Paper text:
One infant-derived bnAb, BF520.1, demonstrated cross-clade neutralization breadth and targeted the V3-glycan region of HIV Env. In contrast to most adult-derived bnAbs, BF520.1 has limited SHM (VH = 6.6%, VK = 5% nt). Here, we identify the naive antibody precursor of BF520.1, describe the subsequent evolution of this antibody lineage, and explore the structural basis for HIV binding for the first and currently only infant-derived HIV-specific bnAb that has been described. We find that 2% SHM is sufficient for broad neutralization for this antibody lineage and that substitutions in the first complementarity-determining region (CDRL1) of the kappa chain are critical for neutralization breadth.
Numbering used by the authors:
A (entry chain A): 33 to 58, 68 to 141, 150 to 185, 188 to 309, 312 to 321, 321A, 322 to 398, 411 to 457, ...
B (entry chain D): 190 to 242
C (entry chain B), D (entry chain E), E (entry chain F): 518 to 550, 566 to 664
The structure:
Amino acid sequence: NLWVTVYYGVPVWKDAETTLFCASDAVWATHACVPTDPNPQEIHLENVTEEFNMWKNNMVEQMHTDIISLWDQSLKPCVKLTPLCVTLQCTNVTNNITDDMRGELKNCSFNMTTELRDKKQKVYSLFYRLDVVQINNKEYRLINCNTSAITQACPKVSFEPIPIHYCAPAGFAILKCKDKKFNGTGPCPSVSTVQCTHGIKPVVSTQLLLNGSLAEEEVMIRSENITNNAKNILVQFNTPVQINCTRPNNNTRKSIRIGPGQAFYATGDIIGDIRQAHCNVSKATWNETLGKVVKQLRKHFGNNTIIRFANSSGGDLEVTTHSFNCGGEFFYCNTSGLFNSTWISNNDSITLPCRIKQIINMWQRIGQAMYAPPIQGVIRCVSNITGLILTRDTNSTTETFRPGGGDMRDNWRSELYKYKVVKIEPLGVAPTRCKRRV
Amino acid sequence: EYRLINCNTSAITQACPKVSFEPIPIHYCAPAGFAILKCKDKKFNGTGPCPSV
Amino acid sequence: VFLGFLGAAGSTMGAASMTLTVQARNLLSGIVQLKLTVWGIKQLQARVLAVERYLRDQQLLGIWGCSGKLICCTNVPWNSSWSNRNLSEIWDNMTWLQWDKEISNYTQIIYGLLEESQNQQEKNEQDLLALD
Amino acid sequence: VFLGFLGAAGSTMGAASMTLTVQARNLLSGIVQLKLTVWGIKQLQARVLAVERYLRDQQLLGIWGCSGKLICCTNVPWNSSWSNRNLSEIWDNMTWLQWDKEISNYTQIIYGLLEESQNQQEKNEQDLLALD
Amino acid sequence: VFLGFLGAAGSTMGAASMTLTVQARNLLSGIVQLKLTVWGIKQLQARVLAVERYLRDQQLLGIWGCSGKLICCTNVPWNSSWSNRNLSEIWDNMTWLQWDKEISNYTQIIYGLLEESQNQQEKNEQDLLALD
Ligand SMILES: *[C@@H]1O[C@H](CO)[C@@H](O[C@@H]2O[C@H](CO)[C@@H](O[C@@H]3O[C@H](CO)[C@@H](O)[C@H](O)[C@@H]3O)[C@H](O)[C@H]2NC(C)=O)[C@H](O)[C@H]1NC(C)=O
Ligand SMILES: *[C@@H]1O[C@H](CO)[C@@H](O[C@@H]2O[C@H](CO)[C@@H](O[C@@H]3O[C@H](CO)[C@@H](O)[C@H](O)[C@@H]3O)[C@H](O)[C@H]2NC(C)=O)[C@H](O)[C@H]1NC(C)=O
Ligand SMILES: *[C@@H]1O[C@H](CO)[C@@H](O[C@@H]2O[C@H](CO)[C@@H](O[C@@H]3O[C@H](CO)[C@@H](O)[C@H](O)[C@@H]3O)[C@H](O)[C@H]2NC(C)=O)[C@H](O)[C@H]1NC(C)=O
Ligand SMILES: *[C@@H]1O[C@H](CO)[C@@H](O[C@@H]2O[C@H](CO)[C@@H](O[C@@H]3O[C@H](CO)[C@@H](O)[C@H](O)[C@@H]3O)[C@H](O)[C@H]2NC(C)=O)[C@H](O)[C@H]1NC(C)=O
Ligand SMILES: *[C@@H]1O[C@H](CO)[C@@H](O[C@@H]2O[C@H](CO)[C@@H](O[C@@H]3O[C@H](CO)[C@@H](O)[C@H](O)[C@@H]3O)[C@H](O)[C@H]2NC(C)=O)[C@H](O)[C@H]1NC(C)=O
Ligand SMILES: *[C@@H]1O[C@H](CO)[C@@H](O[C@@H]2O[C@H](CO)[C@@H](O[C@@H]3O[C@H](CO)[C@@H](O)[C@H](O)[C@@H]3O)[C@H](O)[C@H]2NC(C)=O)[C@H](O)[C@H]1NC(C)=O
Ligand SMILES: *[C@@H]1O[C@H](CO)[C@@H](O[C@@H]2O[C@H](CO)[C@@H](O[C@@H]3O[C@H](CO)[C@@H](O)[C@H](O)[C@@H]3O)[C@H](O)[C@H]2NC(C)=O)[C@H](O)[C@H]1NC(C)=O
Ligand SMILES: *[C@@H]1O[C@H](CO)[C@@H](O[C@@H]2O[C@H](CO)[C@@H](O)[C@H](O)[C@H]2NC(C)=O)[C@H](O)[C@H]1NC(C)=O
Ligand SMILES: *[C@@H]1O[C@H](CO)[C@@H](O[C@@H]2O[C@H](CO)[C@@H](O)[C@H](O)[C@H]2NC(C)=O)[C@H](O)[C@H]1NC(C)=O
Ligand SMILES: *[C@@H]1O[C@H](CO)[C@@H](O[C@@H]2O[C@H](CO)[C@@H](O)[C@H](O)[C@H]2NC(C)=O)[C@H](O)[C@H]1NC(C)=O
Ligand SMILES: *[C@@H]1O[C@H](CO)[C@@H](O[C@@H]2O[C@H](CO)[C@@H](O)[C@H](O)[C@H]2NC(C)=O)[C@H](O)[C@H]1NC(C)=O
Ligand SMILES: *[C@@H]1O[C@H](CO)[C@@H](O[C@@H]2O[C@H](CO)[C@@H](O)[C@H](O)[C@H]2NC(C)=O)[C@H](O)[C@H]1NC(C)=O
Ligand SMILES: *[C@@H]1O[C@H](CO)[C@@H](O[C@@H]2O[C@H](CO)[C@@H](O)[C@H](O)[C@H]2NC(C)=O)[C@H](O)[C@H]1NC(C)=O
Ligand SMILES: *[C@@H]1O[C@H](CO)[C@@H](O[C@@H]2O[C@H](CO)[C@@H](O)[C@H](O)[C@H]2NC(C)=O)[C@H](O)[C@H]1NC(C)=O
Ligand SMILES: *[C@@H]1O[C@H](CO)[C@@H](O[C@@H]2O[C@H](CO)[C@@H](O)[C@H](O)[C@H]2NC(C)=O)[C@H](O)[C@H]1NC(C)=O
Ligand SMILES: *[C@@H]1O[C@H](CO)[C@@H](O[C@@H]2O[C@H](CO)[C@@H](O)[C@H](O)[C@H]2NC(C)=O)[C@H](O)[C@H]1NC(C)=O
Ligand SMILES: *[C@@H]1O[C@H](CO)[C@@H](O)[C@H](O)[C@H]1NC(C)=O
Ligand SMILES: *[C@@H]1O[C@H](CO)[C@@H](O)[C@H](O)[C@H]1NC(C)=O
Ligand SMILES: *[C@@H]1O[C@H](CO)[C@@H](O)[C@H](O)[C@H]1NC(C)=O
Ligand SMILES: *[C@@H]1O[C@H](CO)[C@@H](O)[C@H](O)[C@H]1NC(C)=O
Ligand SMILES: *[C@@H]1O[C@H](CO)[C@@H](O)[C@H](O)[C@H]1NC(C)=O
Ligand SMILES: *[C@@H]1O[C@H](CO)[C@@H](O)[C@H](O)[C@H]1NC(C)=O
Ligand SMILES: *[C@@H]1O[C@H](CO)[C@@H](O)[C@H](O)[C@H]1NC(C)=O
């Protein structure tokens, strides 16, 4: 007869959420974080299979709110720009006649309170017409002042995305499938496990995904519900698509001592190649990759349907255009130049017009706003487009797709789908032929 | 015309009239597993072996 | 042969029992190594939860007179209603995950007798053997 | 019969010993399950103090060679000065609370020999039995 | 004779072994007893680190089938390459600090066999003695 035998160290686990913590090397917000191991360990697990589900992966939720928390903490100790909310006296800026630049900035002046709380000083600064609005030269207002206060980001702190690793506490395991195929959820024939995750950069962007990871095999299409056009579609590329964006303005920073003590960085003068900031895209590369994407689409909609690509529905600029950070500066680009195509039934280069804003609102959050300091000198950078955030638009053939975003949990999820966290249960029992003596 | 010297560098805060600045003897302790070692050697160069620990 | 953490997870319960310690070590792990700040109380909380997580079950093994754990026998007989399979149908043809899939239904029920029967009776008895 | 947490508190020490485990479990309990905030570091502090509170005495039982606790014997004889009563006057006619009322006077004194005597001598001895 | 915490630190390893418990007690110590504030999370952190510091190694002694610690034997033979000295050259003529000075070189190496060999083999074996 068999008896109850007690076992400990049993290799079993249940899907469970706990509090994850970071790790990264030894700028943005990361210093108070445990350095990574010089030899991150892993182990493929043979005969071990189980389901993943990226759409209920609470790792995303934590990461999201943690990044937000970091953001706020990095701003509290910086200078508040409360006394900037004043009536502005502004005029057009006579760019090289006649007018290709459309101005876009105003030579605003105003009676400003200085360190000598008492006698004020008439000063001036160049502002983008996206930041200011006419009251009622003419009178203008900082747009934020009708919604909330605004804080100047410190000139020392940066916004450069840094690779972050996530680790689980003892008793919890980081599981990672290596299956090159994945529908977004279901069993994985090839499952491994790791100490911690790979370095993920906290890149904030809409519409287009930047500097992410690459997919293997073919282009990956992932969606909570492909047939439901109330949902959206994640597209992961196989090959990095280069994009090179430039701001050809060797401008200065006429910092103004609007104390007491604390200093404000206003916009000095704009000189150099007065052209609109824009992005350069390899056209043939875009066409080629887009085609590869359409192949996938064909595979989930039929071998006799029509695929069209267009821009967004419009509205809030933050959603309408492609937003991203380069070197502290915030760009808004008209991606109509990319998302304008079509496919049937079965250099060259592209220039994307961009705009610059200085007053921005993070993560759709209202109640506060952050002032970007102007960055001195010409700003230009390059990155890898590694995926798309697409939405699905008389429904028997032609379908139209367009870029979206808004919810930045989407961005984190586009990477964390490779991971899941489980809770180990060391204690188990089993029937064994054994009668225990004294 | 004169100016408070601090105003060109930063803001300034008034120390509370109740709080004092009198130095008070503080003792330091280590958590369990750690030991506080103390040489009693009247001689010491600033570093090196102590015959009497 | 050293396999690695959970290296035997994809094997039969008999096979897996070979290397329970390789797992045991990292069940508590250890090491790891402007105030507050994000992570400031998260590494705190997590590292705490690890300790609790561990001891909560370790104490049960303390109560279930074994202590010298990973494996130990009892004087509680196995009730046939708790998944009636043969040893070769169990130990030589089933993983630990597959095992739990079934037996998990009677977890607290089995714990009842483990928490008690023997622990109660093994003692008293001894106290009586100490009479002389 | 399951009585409940401290269910035997109002009985003789002999009777109470029947169900020490029912209490033992909840001596550490476990489970439980804008930053800071009131309670934010209080649940923290309390849950910590529980762990320390437990182990501080558990280690003593570790030192006092038993480990398989709730009950164990020693090789230290009882000094008659420590409340000279008969077994029936003690075990069959006194609660644990009433017991402490008296014996608490010699707590550290008794701990001295428990902390030592046997722990010292049981060993060495064994080391010597291992000679052959 | 009570010496005090680390009172035998300046003696031979043989002599020092007499009073290991006097040290053992304070390895975890216990007791100790506007928000945040300096010290507010430092006493916290420190007291935590003490608990972890302790258990991290205590678990190893749990794995190394002894538990009844301070001293216990194994079934692992000593490799002569690990500082080849005689017992009188070691135990009767060397402090623990001096000992570590040398043997520390093979710490993890020795731990390998302690973590395993016996722990693996002592068991199975027993399981087989339980056949009848
Ligand atoms: C801050 O800049 C504002 C303009 O942005 C200056 O406003 C000027 O303020 C004075 C006092 O309110 C106005 O002067 C008065 O005007 C009336 C009519 O012209 C005249 O009857 C009075 O004798 C007196 O001069 C002035 O018109 C107004 N300017 C405008 C454009 O409205 C203000 O002076 C500036 N402060 C600093 C310190 O420069
Ligand atoms: C933008 O508005 C600012 C005022 O808010 C204008 O500032 C003016 O800038 C010029 C060039 O720096 C200054 O002119 C120079 O002044 C000195 C002394 O008066 C003179 O020696 C030079 O020959 C030259 O004229 C001017 O004084 C300054 N005004 C003030 C109030 O400081 C600037 O012109 C505006 N830009 C646009 C396009 O209108
Ligand atoms: C994917 O999501 C889509 C939409 O979010 C789900 O589509 C829903 O499918 C059901 C079944 O075809 C439709 O229900 C039927 O609707 C008609 C009219 O409302 C009603 O007469 C029937 O009694 C029935 O409820 C539902 O309307 C349709 N929703 C929409 C937006 O078209 C689909 O079920 C989702 N798949 C997954 C696996 O959940
Ligand atoms: C994306 O590109 C499409 C064209 O491919 C742009 O379509 C434009 O969308 C707006 C909003 O639906 C239309 O404006 C409305 O037009 C009516 C009539 O002209 C007018 O009564 C309204 O006051 C309003 O302006 C506009 O006509 C339409 N253009 C065409 C060619 O149909 C859309 O603006 C583009 N989005 C981005 C962000 O540029
Ligand atoms: C992963 O699961 C596979 C089955 O899907 C397990 O395969 C087993 O692997 C071992 C090693 O290759 C085979 O054992 C060898 O078999 C031969 C003939 O029976 C015997 O001569 C050797 O002494 C040895 O036992 C075993 O037959 C093979 N099983 C089958 C179905 O092919 C593997 O063990 C699994 N790994 C885990 C960790 O459980
Ligand atoms: C609470 O204290 C009361 C006394 O104040 C304890 O009463 C005892 O209760 C038990 C159960 O009813 C009685 O035991 C039974 O007695 C009869 C005759 O002696 C015997 O035939 C049965 O086998 C059984 O032992 C006991 O006599 C009674 N004591 C007295 C003084 O009446 C009760 O045990 C206390 N509870 C706690 C948890 O200690
Ligand atoms: C500190 O180190 C000193 C040596 O530097 C150790 O000295 C030893 O002290 C004991 C006690 O005074 C001596 O033991 C006695 O020796 C006599 C003759 O051998 C014997 O008749 C007694 O039964 C007893 O053993 C010992 O000889 C002396 N050693 C020497 C070199 O003089 C002392 O033990 C050290 N303390 C620590 C804690 O290790
Ligand atoms: C600043 O220049 C802009 C053009 O760059 C002028 O814009 C005109 O503004 C009025 C009022 O909104 C409109 O009636 C005109 O149709 C606008 N013109 C165009 C080209 O859109 C504005 O008048 C200029 N201000 C100054 C003082 O001359
Ligand atoms: C706060 O100011 C904003 C502009 O900075 C106002 O926004 C306008 O809101 C109405 C209603 O949604 C729209 O018709 C306008 O097009 C918006 N303007 C822009 C710039 O987007 C808003 O009305 C202001 N609130 C207060 C109470 O006046
Ligand atoms: C763009 O992504 C490509 C991967 O497709 C990256 O390629 C790496 O490029 C460097 C420089 O040539 C090589 O050292 C690496 O070995 C390349 N990787 C592979 C996979 O071939 C490139 O680094 C990416 N750029 C950005 C800015 O991240
Ligand atoms: C769409 O038609 C293509 C052929 O034009 C089909 O292609 C097959 O796809 C599967 C999956 O990749 C392969 O197993 C076959 O070998 C492919 N055939 C050939 C000719 O390459 C695809 O099955 C079609 N889809 C529909 C729904 O019928
Ligand atoms: C959408 O892109 C197409 C090219 O893919 C653009 O097509 C141009 O359309 C105009 C109007 O019919 C013609 O004058 C051009 O010759 C067309 N170009 C070519 C390549 O055929 C169209 O302009 C684009 N729309 C957007 C808003 O940029
Ligand atoms: C801030 O004010 C201080 C005086 O309160 C200025 O200090 C002078 O600095 C120069 C350069 O080091 C020295 O030549 C003077 O002797 C300093 N004065 C004293 C009182 O030490 C400093 O220049 C001021 N900064 C600003 C921007 O004006
Ligand atoms: C094994 O445990 C089962 C419950 O898991 C016990 O089942 C009882 O069996 C008897 C006989 O069929 C019935 O009278 C009871 O109603 C059953 N209980 C329930 C919960 O269904 C069985 O008694 C147990 N065997 C041992 C030896 O205790
Ligand atoms: C029992 O412990 C008591 C102290 O609790 C010891 O009492 C000593 O007894 C002798 C004889 O009466 C006196 O010389 C001492 O002065 C007493 N000590 C004190 C503290 O009063 C007694 O020795 C102990 N018995 C055992 C066997 O050790
Ligand atoms: C004792 O351990 C040493 C290593 O610390 C072992 O050394 C090996 O000895 C043999 C014979 O000289 C050599 O072939 C190996 O290359 C040595 N290893 C190294 C690391 O130098 C020795 O085998 C061990 N003895 C026991 C019984 O295991
Ligand atoms: C993209 O290339 C495809 C063929 O691969 C072609 O059908 C389409 O016209 C191309 N687009 C561009 C802009 O040339
Ligand atoms: C138990 O296994 C034997 C063979 O060893 C088999 O005959 C019997 O069917 C097995 N049990 C079950 C419930 O079938
Ligand atoms: C365990 O029982 C639950 C109902 O209590 C049931 O949902 C599940 O299927 C059961 N598992 C087994 C193996 O029968
Ligand atoms: C011990 O109990 C006996 C009866 O069992 C009694 O004769 C004696 O008085 C008791 N002890 C005390 C101190 O009285
Ligand atoms: C314990 O002794 C203390 C004095 O040390 C005294 O106050 C108390 O009454 C004593 N208890 C006993 C039972 O005598
Ligand atoms: C071991 O000690 C003996 C004396 O007991 C000695 O003869 C021999 O030299 C010692 N070992 C070493 C390595 O010398
Ligand atoms: C231990 O070996 C290290 C090199 O691995 C060396 O630096 C040190 O001297 C060694 N100690 C012994 C006692 O030889």
